[PDB]
Nucleic acid binder design. Structure first.
Ligand SMILES: NCCC[C@H](N)CC(=O)NCCC[C@H](N)CC(=O)NCCC[C@H](N)CC(=O)N[C@@H]1[C@H](O)[C@@H](OC(N)=O)[C@@H](CO)O[C@H]1NC1=N[C@@H]2C(=O)NC[C@@H](O)[C@H]2N1
Ligand SMILES: NCCC[C@H](N)CC(=O)NCCC[C@H](N)CC(=O)NCCC[C@H](N)CC(=O)N[C@@H]1[C@H](O)[C@@H](OC(N)=O)[C@@H](CO)O[C@H]1NC1=N[C@@H]2C(=O)NC[C@@H](O)[C@H]2N1
Lengths: 130, 122
RNA sequence: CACGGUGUGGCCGAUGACUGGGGUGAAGUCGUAACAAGGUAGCCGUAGGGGAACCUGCGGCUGGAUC
RNA sequence: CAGAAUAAGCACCGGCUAACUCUGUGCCAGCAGCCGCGGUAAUACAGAGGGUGCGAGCGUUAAUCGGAUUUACUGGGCGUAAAGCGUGCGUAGGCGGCUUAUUAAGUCGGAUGUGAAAUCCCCGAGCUUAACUUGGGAAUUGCAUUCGAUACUGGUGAGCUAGAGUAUGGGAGAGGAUGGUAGAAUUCCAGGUGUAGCGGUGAAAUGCGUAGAGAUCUGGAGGAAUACCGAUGGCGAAGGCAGCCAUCUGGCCUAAUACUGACGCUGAGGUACGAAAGCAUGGGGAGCAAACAGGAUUAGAUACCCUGGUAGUCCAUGCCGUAAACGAUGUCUACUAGCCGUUGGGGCCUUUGAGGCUUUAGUGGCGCAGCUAACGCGAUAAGUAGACCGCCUGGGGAGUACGGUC
RNA sequence: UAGUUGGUGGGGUAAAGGCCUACCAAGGCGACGAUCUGUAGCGGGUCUGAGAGGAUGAUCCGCCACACUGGGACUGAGACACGGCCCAGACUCCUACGGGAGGCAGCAGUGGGGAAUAUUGGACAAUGGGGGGAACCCUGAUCCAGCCAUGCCGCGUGUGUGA
């Protein structure tokens, strides 16, 4: 059965980018919305929309391409239900020497690894993006 | 293997076995020559190799190779044996130290004398 | 209560007339089972038979050539 | 104070690996960490000359970690190289849909106490230098208490319907169990016609036949299996399931409403089923046929071929638990170009009846991207990801021995 | 697993406590591995490794345990006491056969084992320890010396010229 919806979202994004889609849609949740907002702020995607027709809600992401290649070259789930990963402020991972971003869930919200370092807090490492 | 499988059962490590069990982790061993004889090598080698059967202080009964040209060993000699394989004589895993206890140093040598135990000629 | 004794059992090691299979060496003897459709396609399970590779029955596979 | 006066060896030179020739010997003597040298021009054996590396040391043996991503947490694999249990169900456990309030266990941050000295590291100091000694730091990645944060995970309360399940209509099927029945054919028996062969092989022979065979026609007995349909078709968890009819019975597909409201996925132990052969008790026995007998072939034939033929193959009730039990590919979930078939349904469109578009659940052929050592796989993945389980660690010895369970 | 798990009365100890005892109850531990069995002193540290890990626990420091093999207690603030006592066991020694004696895993040393590891040395001058008012006495702790290329570091075995 489906037990990791965050990994499902990342996999949908990766497959859509590999298939050169312009738009990718999925069932929505607040966690996926926060992750998509972080990606949009960092510039990996263009637009984030949420359509709430009924009790069901659909999340839509607009993808970006640049010089014939997708902007997101690597997206990797790090913490998983079978093995959760938590790091302190001094052990936050760096993605290819700072040219990437590690998405971190902290007690002050979802933010990037450098933002978490600036705020001096740790948390759960959700994904690596580059 | 999944993380849960690793937690339930770890990673096993296979212990190694010594190639010189008769030494019993010692650098050398004393022994008494039970037999002094000659054997033939395996293919593609052909020669007449000088071997002894030695009873060690460890309790084992092994075979050792005599190196160099010319040896004075006979049955009931007291010798010192170290590790070392010949690789052309099956079942021979040890060497006899020339010039230690009853083994004499090889004569007429002037190169590589420390092996074969030949003192420096004047 | 320590040590000791008696009876009866369990476990560990050593040793033993004789006996079974295994490996290595060397090519002495009998055959030619497999590799080509290997000259009866091969192999798997099982059962019976035979100096020996092996043979035959029943079911299965293609990891079988040619039509 | 006197005088160069008292003071230099060890390993190696085929490649890995810096350093090459000559004599002696001729698979001998010997060398060897691995690959390998030696059988008359040996840079690989022994000596010599020369050189190379170290140097009061130089080599060998033993031992630990490394190289070894060669147990892979960091950081590996299982179609064919070793590796998916034969297949299901399910216990403990692991993991688990969306919204919201709360809690602060996991998680994160601060403060305080502690984490002996020595040791490691840094800056100095004293040894004629260095080893060594020593001052001060840094470090001791940890533990405990207490105060905070609430994104995620967990707990609790409430709510929801996209997962899962229930009721009602309709449909396809060799799905399973029991009983009955029909037609073709083989064998045997009796009879009619009728007379010298029949059968078998590469060729023969064993065998059958003048007390009459084989052939042909009529009538009886019995057992086993279901031609054509028949299909890259169908059904079943797998093993497997084919004439027709009735009875009992499981699953699946399909439409729209209504209903419950996460009731789910996987699954160590466990348990159920599980081809063929085999075993036990009692029946049955046409055909076929291990064992066996005879005839051939052959140097021999124990076999392949031929004539016979017992167990068995069949039924009832139980056991056994193994197969190249194979897609050599564990189960569940989501996503990722297209083209052409076929099976069971739903919808729409033409216009009178047969076609054309779609959609869904199976079953096939190609093939973009991606993957792979290659072969190849490619929406029925061996692609992209997640959850759980099983398994592998050079070839033999060996799925073997001892012990144990059945 | 049957003082076994808990409770009550009593005993006992410097002190909590099944530590002991008499009753009452049926409890307690175990797949997060009880019971049984093999091996093993533990740590600060040491070696290796980029790290994570792996191996190791000489010399220095902390803790524990043992003192020929087992069982006890006495004295004392403190021991169930290496060079104290009692009992049992094995072994060794003297004897005039009456009777006695002993425990190097302290330092040195002997025999044996092994591939292999040293002197039957000096002084209490220094730092400590015991006794004493002190003088001072004792101290194989210690400080030194002897032996070994075992390791690390340093130095020498000559320098210039000379075809
Ligand atoms: N989701 C669940 C669905 C379950 C269902 N199973 C569907 C499924 O999942 N299928 C997966 C496909 C895997 C397939 N089994 C592998 C394969 O096909 N060969 C194995 C690989 C061997 C080799 N690398 C290729 C090879 O030699 N090929 C031959 C070849 O082309 C040709 O032979 C000759 N002489 O020219 C042909 C004619 O016979 O035979 C093929 N060989 C075969 N053809 C058969 C076939 O397809 N199947 C059964 C078996 O018989 C197969 N062997
Ligand atoms: N009580 C002590 C027991 C010690 C131990 N439990 C048993 C033991 O050692 N028994 C021996 C034994 O009886 C015997 O010797 C042999 N060899 O048989 C005897 C010869 O006289 O000596 C005894 N030993 C002795 N040691 C003692 C010692 O030195 N002085 C006094 C006296 O007691 C001596 N006896």
């Amino acid at each position: 059965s489906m037990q990791d919806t965050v990994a499902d979202m990342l996999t949908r994004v990766r497959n859509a980018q590999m298939a050169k889609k312009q738009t990718v849609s999925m069932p929505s949740s607040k966690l996926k919305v926060a992750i998509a907002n972080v990606l949009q702020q960092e510039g990996y995607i263009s637009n984030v929309e949420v359509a709430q027709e009924e009790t069901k809600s659909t999340l839509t992401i607009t993808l970006k391409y640049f010089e014939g290649k997708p902007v997101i070259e690597m997206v990797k789930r790090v913490s998983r239900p079978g093995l959760r990963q938590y790091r302190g402020k001094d052990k936050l991972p760096s993605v290819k020497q700072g040219l990437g971003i590690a998405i971190v869930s902290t007690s002050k919200g979802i933010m990037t690894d450098r933002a978490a370092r600036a705020a001096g807090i740790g948390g759960e490492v959700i994904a690596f993006v580059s | 293997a999944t993380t849960n499988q690793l937690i339930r059962k770890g990673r096993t490590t296979l212990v190694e076995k010594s190639k010189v069990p008769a030494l019993k982790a010692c650098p050398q061993r004393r022994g008494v020559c039970t037999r002094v004889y000659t054997t033939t090598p395996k293919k593609p080698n052909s020669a007449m190799r000088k071997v002894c059967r030695v009873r060690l202080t460890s309790g084992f009964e092994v075979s050792s190779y005599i190196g160099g040209e010319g040896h004075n060993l006979q049955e009931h000699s007291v010798v010192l044996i170290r590790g070392g394989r010949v690789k052309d004589l099956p079942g021979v895993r040890y060497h006899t130290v020339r010039g230690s206890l009853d083994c004499a140093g090889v004569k007429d040598r002037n190169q590589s004398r420390s092996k074969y135990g030949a003192k420096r000629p004047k």
